[PDB]
From TrEMBL, chain A:
Transmembrane segments: none annotated. A motif (Nuclear localization signal) lies at residues 187-195, 203-216. It comes from Influenza B virus (B/Memphis/13/2003). The lineage of its organism: Viruses, Riboviria, Orthornavirae, Negarnaviricota, Polyploviricotina. Residues 286-482 form the RdRp catalytic domain. Keywords: Eukaryotic host gene expression shutoff by virus, Eukaryotic host transcription shutoff by virus, Host cytoplasm, Host gene expression shutoff by virus, Host nucleus, Host-virus interaction, Inhibition of host RNA polymerase II by virus, Metal-binding, Nucleotide-binding, Nucleotidyltransferase, Phosphoprotein, RNA-directed RNA polymerase, Transferase, Viral RNA replication, Viral transcription. This is RNA-directed RNA polymerase catalytic subunit.
TrEMBL record, chain C:
Plays an essential role in viral RNA transcription and replication by forming the heterotrimeric polymerase complex together with PB1 and PB2 subunits. The complex transcribes viral mRNAs by using a unique mechanism called cap-snatching. It consists in the hijacking and cleavage of host capped pre-mRNAs. These short capped RNAs are then used as primers for viral mRNAs. The PB2 subunit is responsible for the binding of the 5' cap of cellular pre-mRNAs which are subsequently cleaved after 10-13 nucleotides by the PA subunit that carries the endonuclease activity. Belongs to the influenza viruses PA family. Influenza RNA polymerase is composed of three subunits: PB1, PB2 and PA. Interacts (via C-terminus) with PB1 (via N-terminus). The gene is PA. It is found in: Host cytoplasm; Host nucleus. This is Polymerase acidic protein. Phosphorylated on serines and threonines by host kinases, including human casein kinase II.
RNA sequence: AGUAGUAACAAG
C-alpha cells in the first residue's frame, strides 16, 4: 500500500484543506551574490514593452527616454505599456460620475493634511536611498544627511518645520549649479593575516565634504538603488526590487494620501482596507453580485492575476491621473502633486554590484563594477549576460547606471495604481452588450464578477475587460488567471468557497520567536496564538500545542530552560541557583527558568501581571528595578510596537502588552563589521544621542509628545534651565552659591549660542 | 521707504525677536511692515518696564547701572514673556 | 499714513528651471509641453 | 569537495 497525500482531496475540498498546499515550514528562497543580472532584466523588459513608443534624449540628464503612452495599440497578447490618455481620462470621468465630489473632497483633505504635515513625517518610511553616501540607510538618517548637506548650499527650508518649504528646497536644489554634501570615505591600513593572500585591509570610515555638479546631482536625485528580493514565497526565480531617494518621499506621501481618500470611498477597492474589514467588504460584494444575477442567467468569477504590473504602468499616466483628480484645486497643490510622477518619468536605475569574473584554473575571482561592465569584451561573459548587456547598451550611462523612463520599478503608487484598476472595473460594459462586469482591486490583484445570460456571453465581457485594461497599461495574466461560475475564487491569497476559508499555513512563520527581546517576544508569541484562534480557525487543541511549541522554541532560543531541568548553560547555572534560592517559583518568569502557566483563557495577560502576586518581593524588586541598566531610553514606539514579518506581504508593525523590566533589554547596534573601525560613525551616533538625552533631561514630555518650535534646541534648553534655576533658588530647593554657579554657567552658554 | 525706517530707529535684537514672532504667526515682515512696527514698539515698551529693575536677597526693588556686570544682579523684577518663542 | 490706513497669505510653491523642464519632457506623446497637457485634461471630453 | 542553483559561499 502506497500513501498519496493528494488523496485527502477526495474526502476534503481543496479550499477546505488549502493550508496543506502552503509549504511554509520550508526555507524561503534567498539570493546569493549580485542583483545586476535581475536589475538589467527589468531595464530590458520594461523597454521591450514600450520600444514601439517615442524614443528621445533628455536635454536635462542626456539619458535615453522611451514614451509608450498614446503609442501604437498592441497587435499581440505580450505585455503592453501603450496606454491611451483618452481612455484613462474616460475611465476617471466615469468614476467621477459614479462618485460626485470625491475627486475634489480627496484633493481638499490631502491638501489640508499637507499644510499641517511637518518634515519629521518623512522618518516614518523604511530603508531609503541616501544620495550623499550612494547606499540605503534608514529614512530618519537619509533625511538628516539631506537636511545637514542642504545647509551647505543655503537651503534652510527644513528649519521652518512644515513639509512644503522642505519640498520647495528639494525642487530648488535641482537648479543649484553645484552641490556640496557630507559623504563618508574610509582610510585603508594594510595589516598581516594568517591566510593564502598573506595580508589584510583594515578600513576606517570618516565623514568628509564632497562637491558634485548640477547634472551629476540631478542624476543622483532621480536615481533608484536596486537589490534582489530575499525570502519571497511561491516563486522559482528571483526578481529585482528598487528603493527611491528621500527627495521624492514627501511628494509620494501626498499623492498616496490623495489616492487613499479616493480608494476609501470606492466600493471595489481592497486597499487601504485590510484583514477582517477586507474579508467583510469582499463577502458583501460577492453576496450582492449573487442576488443581482439575472434569473436564467449565470454569474462567473475571474480569479485575476496581472503580469508585468510595475513594468507596464507609466509615470506619465499617473501625472495625468494627478492632473485630472486635482481639477478644482489651487495651482500650487496641482503643481505639488505633479512632481512625484515627473521625478519617476525621468528616473535612473542603479545596476547594483556588477558581475564577478573568475579563473577556475588559477582559482581567482574579481568583481567588475557597473561603470567597468563594458571594460572587457562581451565574449568573456556567459550567453545570458552577453545578451542582456547588448540590449542594455542604448539605456546604459557612463557612470554604471541605466535610464528607466517607463515602468514603476520602485512601486510606491499602490493606491493610485489601484484607483486606475478600479477605473477599469468601473466601465462595467462595452457597446451595450448583454453582460455586466464589476469586481475587487488590491494593487495588481483583482477578482472580476461577470453577469450574463450564458457563459459564452460572460467570456465576451471578460475578453472586453481584458482589452479595456490594455488601454490603461494593465496586462491580465492569461497563464495565472482562470474563471468559474460564482461560488469560489482566490483574492490576495484569501480563498473563497461559499465564504472565506481559513488558511493557517500563511500565518505559521509568525508563530516563531519574534526576536525583539525575551519580554516582548513572550507577549507577541501568546498574542499571535490568541489572534490565530480568533481569525485563522486555530482550534483549542492546536492553540494549546502552539503554547508548548512556542515555550520549547523560547527556552532553546533564550537559553532559559526550567530551573529543575539538568540542562548545561552559563545562564542555566544562575537559573538553577535562582530556582533553589526562590520560595514562590510559580512567580518566576519562563526567562528566569520559571514554569509556564499560560493557557487559552489568559493569553492576553502580561506574564509579569499573571505571576505578580506569586512572586518573592526580593525577585519582584530586582525584576522591576526602576533604574535597572538593561532598559535604555524608551520611546512610546519602544514599549508597544514591534516589526512582525509575515510569510506573504510587507513587514508590518504589531502592538504587544508587556511590563517594562530587566528582560525588556535591547541588543547592541550592528557595529560589528569585519576589518572595519566604526569609531567615527559611532561618535556621530553618540553625539546626537547625548544632545537628545540632555534635551529629554530638561523637557520630560519630549519622549511622549513631539516637541514643537523653529528655534534652536539650545535656546529651548537654556530658557528652561534658567527658569528651573531661578524658581529652585526662590523656592529654597537650590542654595545661594549653587544659584550663582548656575547663572554664571548659563551666562557662558548664553554667549556661546549668539 | 518703511523697511529703512524700522531698521534705523529700533534695535537689532528688537527687530529679530519681532520678525521671529511674526514668522510663528505665519506673517511676512518684508511684505506687511504695518505689523512689524506695532510688535517692535510693544516689545521696546515691554523691555523699558523690565530694564534695570532687579530684586535683591531681601526681595526689595533696586535699579542697576548700564556697566555693572551680569554677575552682581541675577534676578530681574519682571519676566519678559513677550518676544519669546510660543512654546518657551 | 501707513500705520493708520491684512492680505490673504496664498501658499508659496514655485517650480524652478530644471523641474519645469523635467515636467515638460514628462508629458505623453502628442503634447509640446506640460501647459498643453494640463489644458487638454482640463478642457477636452474623452467620451467614446 | 560540497552546499547550493541563473550566483555565490567554501573566512577577510
Amino acid at each position: 500500500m502506497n500513501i498519496n497525500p493528494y488523496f485527502l482531496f477526495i474526502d476534503v475540498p481543496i479550499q477546505a484543506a488549502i493550508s496543506t498546499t502552503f509549504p511554509y515550514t520550508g526555507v524561503p528562497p534567498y539570493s546569493h551574490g549580485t542583483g545586476t543580472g535581475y536589475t538589467i532584466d527589468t531595464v530590458i523588459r520594461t523597454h521591450e514593452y514600450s520600444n514601439k513608443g517615442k524614443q528621445y534624449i533628455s536635454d536635462v540628464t542626456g539619458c535615453t527616454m522611451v514614451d509608450p503612452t498614446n503609442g501604437p495599440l498592441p497587435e499581440d497578447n505580450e505585455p503592453s505599456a501603450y496606454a491611451q490618455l483618452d481612455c484613462v481620462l474616460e475611465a476617471l470621468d466615469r468614476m467621477d460620475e459614479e462618485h460626485p465630489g470625491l475627486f475634489q473632497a480627496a484633493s481638499q483633505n490631502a491638501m489640508e493634511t499637507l499644510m499641517v504635515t511637518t518634515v519629521d513625517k518623512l522618518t516614518q518610511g523604511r530603508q531609503t536611498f541616501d544620495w550623499t553616501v550612494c547606499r540605503n540607510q534608514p529614512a530618519a538618517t537619509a533625511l538628516n544627511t539631506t537636511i545637514t548637506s542642504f545647509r551647505l548650499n543655503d537651503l534652510n527650508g527644513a528649519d521652518k518645520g512644515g513639509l512644503i518649504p522642505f519640498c520647495q528646497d528639494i525642487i530648488d536644489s535641482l537648479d543649484r549649479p553645484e552641490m556640496t554634501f557630507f559623504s563618508v570615505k574610509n582610510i585603508k591600513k594594510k595589516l598581516p593575516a594568517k591566510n593564502r593572500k598573506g595580508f589584510l585591509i583594515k578600513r576606517i570610515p570618516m565623514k568628509v565634504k564632497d562637491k558634485i555638479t548640477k547634472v551629476e546631482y540631478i542624476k543622483r536625485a532621480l536615481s533608484l538603488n536596486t537589490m534582489t528580493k530575499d525570502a519571497e514565497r511561491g516563486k522559482l526565480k528571483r526578481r529585482a526590487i528598487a528603493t527611491a531617494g528621500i527627495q521624492i518621499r514627501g511628494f509620494v506621501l501626498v499623492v498616496e494620501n490623495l489616492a487613499k481618500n479616493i480608494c476609501e470611498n470606492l466600493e471595489q477597492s481592497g486597499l487601504p482596507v485590510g484583514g477582517n474589514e477586507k474579508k467583510a467588504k469582499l463577502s458583501n460584494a460577492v453576496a450582492k453580485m449573487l442576488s443581482n444575477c439575472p434569473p436564467g442567467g449565470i454569474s462567473m468569477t475571474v480569479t485575476g492575476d496581472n503580469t508585468k504590473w510595475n513594468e507596464c504602468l507609466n509615470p506619465r499616466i499617473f501625472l495625468a491621473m494627478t492632473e485630472r483628480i486635482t481639477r478644482d484645486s489651487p495651482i500650487w497643490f496641482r503643481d505639488f502633486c505633479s512632481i512625484a510622477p515627473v521625478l519617476f518619468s525621468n528616473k535612473i536605475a542603479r545596476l547594483g554590484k556588477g558581475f564577478m569574473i573568475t579563473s577556475k584554473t588559477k582559482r581567482l575571482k574579481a568583481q567588475i563594477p557597473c561603470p567597468d561592465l563594458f571594460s572587457i569584451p562581451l565574449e568573456r561573459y556567459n550567453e545570458e549576460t552577453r545578451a542582456k548587456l547588448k540590449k542594455l547598451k542604448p539605456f546604459f550611462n557612463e557612470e554604471g547606471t541605466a535610464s528607466l523612463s517607463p515602468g514603476m520599478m520602485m512601486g510606491m503608487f499602490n493606491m493610485l495604481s489601484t484607483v486606475l484598476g478600479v477605473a477599469a472595473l468601473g466601465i462595467k460594459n462595452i457597446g451595450n452588450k448583454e453582460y455586466l462586469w464589476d469586481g475587487l482591486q488590491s494593487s495588481d490583484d483583482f477578482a472580476l464578477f461577470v453577469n450574463a445570460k450564458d457563459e459564452e456571453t460572460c467570456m465576451e465581457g471578460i475578453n472586453d475587460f481584458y482589452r479595456t485594461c490594455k488601454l490603461l497599461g494593465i496586462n491580465m495574466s492569461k497563464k495565472k488567471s482562470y474563471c468559474n461560475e460564482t461560488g469560489m475564487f482566490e483574492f490576495t491569497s484569501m480563498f473563497y468557497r461559499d465564504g472565506f476559508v481559513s488558511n493557517f499555513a500563511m500565518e505559521l512563520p509568525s508563530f516563531g520567536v519574534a526576536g525583539v527581546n525575551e519580554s516582548a517576544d513572550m507577549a507577541i508569541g501568546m498574542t499571535i496564538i490568541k489572534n490565530n484562534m480568533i481569525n485563522n480557525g486555530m482550534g483549542p487543541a492546536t492553540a494549546q500545542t502552539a503554547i508548548q511549541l512556542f515555550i520549547a522554541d523560547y527556552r532553546y532560543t533564550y537559553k532559559c530552560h526550567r530551573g529543575d531541568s539538568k540542562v548545561e548553560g552559563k545562564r542555566m547555572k544562575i537559573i538553577k541557583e535562582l530556582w533553589e534560592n526562590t520560595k514562590g517559583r510559580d512567580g518566576l518568569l519562563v526567562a528566569d527558568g520559571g514554569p509556564n502557566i499560560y493557557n487559552l483563557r489568559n493569553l492576553h495577560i502580561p506574564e509579569i501581571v499573571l505571576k505578580y502576586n506569586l512572586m518573592d518581593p526580593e525577585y519582584k524588586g530586582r525584576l522591576l528595578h526602576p533604574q535597572n541598566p538593561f532598559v535604555g531610553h524608551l520611546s512610546i514606539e519602544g514599549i508597544k510596537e514591534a516589526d512582525i514579518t509575515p510569510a506573504h506581504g510587507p513587514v508590518k508593525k504589531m502592538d504587544y502588552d508587556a511590563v517594562s523590566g530587566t528582560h525588556s533589554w535591547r541588543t547592541k547596534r550592528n557595529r560589528s563589521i569585519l576589518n572595519t573601525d566604526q569609531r567615527n560613525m559611532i561618535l556621530e551616533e553618540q553625539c546626537y544621542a547625548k544632545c537628545c538625552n540632555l534635551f529629554e533631561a530638561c523637557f520630560n514630555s519630549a519622549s511622549y509628545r513631539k516637541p514643537v518650535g523653529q528655534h534652536s534646541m539650545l535656546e529651548a534648553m537654556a530658557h528652561r534651565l534658567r527658569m528651573d534655576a531661578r524658581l529652585d533658588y526662590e523656592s529654597g530647593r537650590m542654595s545661594k552659591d549653587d544659584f550663582e554657579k548656575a547663572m554664571a554657567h548659563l551666562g557662558e552658554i548664553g554667549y556661546i549660542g549668539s | 521707504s518703511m523697511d529703512t525706517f524700522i531698521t534705523r530707529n529700533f534695535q537689532t535684537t528688537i527687530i529679530q525677536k519681532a520678525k521671529n514672532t511674526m514668522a510663528e504667526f505665519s506673517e511676512d515682515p518684508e511684505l506687511q511692515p504695518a505689523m512689524l512696527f506695532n510688535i517692535c514698539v510693544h516689545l521696546e515698551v515691554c523691555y523699558v518696564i523690565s530694564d534695570m529693575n532687579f530684586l535683591d536677597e531681601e526681595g526689595k526693588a533696586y535699579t542697576a547701572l548700564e556697566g555693572q556686570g551680569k554677575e552682581q544682579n541675577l534676578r530681574p523684577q519682571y519676566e519678559v514673556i513677550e518676544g519669546m518663542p510660543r512654546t518657551i | 499714513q501707513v500705520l493708520i490706513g491684512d492680505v490673504e497669505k496664498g501658499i508659496d510653491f514655485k517650480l524652478g528651471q530644471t523641474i519645469s523642464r523635467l515636467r515638460d519632457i514628462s508629458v505623453p506623446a502628442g503634447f509640446s509641453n506640460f501647459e498643453g497637457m494640463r489644458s487638454y485634461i482640463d478642457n477636452i471630453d474623452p467620451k467614446g
